[PDB]
Design a protein. Sequence first.
Lengths: 162, 162
Amino acid sequence: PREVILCKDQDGKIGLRLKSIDNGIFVQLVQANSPASLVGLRFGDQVLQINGENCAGWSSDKAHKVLKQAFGEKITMTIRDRPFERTITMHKDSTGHVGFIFKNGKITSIVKDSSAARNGLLTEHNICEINGQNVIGLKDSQIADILSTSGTVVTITIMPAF
Amino acid sequence: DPREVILCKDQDGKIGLRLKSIDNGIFVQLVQANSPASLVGLRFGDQVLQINGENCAGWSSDKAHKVLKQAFGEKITMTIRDRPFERTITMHKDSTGHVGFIFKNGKITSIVKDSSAARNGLLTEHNICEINGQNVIGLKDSQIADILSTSGTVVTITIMPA
Ligand SMILES: CC(=O)c1ccc(F)c(-c2ccc(C[C@@H](C(=O)N[C@@H](C)C(=O)O)N3Cc4cc(Br)ccc4C3=O)cc2)c1
Ligand SMILES: CC(=O)c1ccc(F)c(-c2ccc(C[C@@H](C(=O)N[C@@H](C)C(=O)O)N3Cc4cc(Br)ccc4C3=O)cc2)c1
């Protein structure tokens, strides 16, 4: 658990969208070049507390109601670094592929006798990083450009789509 | 990193394991006490990458059991990824002897407000696997309650999404 302080920029907005998942509050959307982006907030981070109050059981509307109705331009948050994050290493075959089909940044299929198949890569998982580069927010064709310019080793970080 | 385990059948060609297809992968759903599977370290939620050399990718629950049933000699080789969905949460009992969560069939279904569980971001729709190193998979709810009731102030629980 870590504590991040956020300064509200002009319209009392943090550039953050939160979602209620399994009675927890998670980071769902982080706008680029925003107060939230600045202090390290990433897709899949868990918010434990907002201004010292527990987020447990809060609905998605409650979390946003709290963030806007907060007095003063400073909001403290206690965060847990993407708890659902897993890393999987794969190798390109002779055709330059590791073996998976994706749509909207989410793995939808695994090709038989592929590197993804040998390494137990899962479907219904969003891709977060490829070889260190963040891919949340990129269009599918830009993600394919990163995969295409990769060496033989393809390490991807994934999380269940939820 | 995955590890290889060698399993020797006990008498009836039984390995003492129950499998489950999840997200085009195969995971262990139950490990029998004192069995060949229990002997080599297999635990609930372990991922099976290969059975006797072939990829489990896309295999159904029935397919995995069919392949295990139809194994030739008394030796079944398996490539395992150690419980990939495992998270550990440490909580402290309050003055009334509780950490603050409700469960049914071994699954967290509610988080009590202002509790140690709420402070630690404990999540619902998660199966409880262990409590202070004691495996609780396969136990009745009143037996899980008995383990919590006789625990010290520190309560560390291992969980996995349902
Ligand atoms: C045995 C093995 O490995 C193998 C053997 C033969 C094959 F024809 C393949 C294979 C070839 C191409 C692809 C395409 C696949 C892809 O390039 N995936 C990467 C991650 C990869 O497999 O390396 N993309 C590209 C793409 C772009 C955009 Br815009 C949107 C979606 C996608 C997508 O799913 C998929 C499979 C695979
Ligand atoms: C502030 C705080 O903590 C707190 C405040 C007020 C509270 F009324 C509680 C609290 C009291 C009791 C329980 C019961 C709850 C329980 O004992 N859970 C443990 C894990 C715990 O909370 O320590 N079980 C026991 C049980 C047995 C069987 Br059989 C089936 C289901 C369950 C179940 O969910 C739950 C909450 C707690």
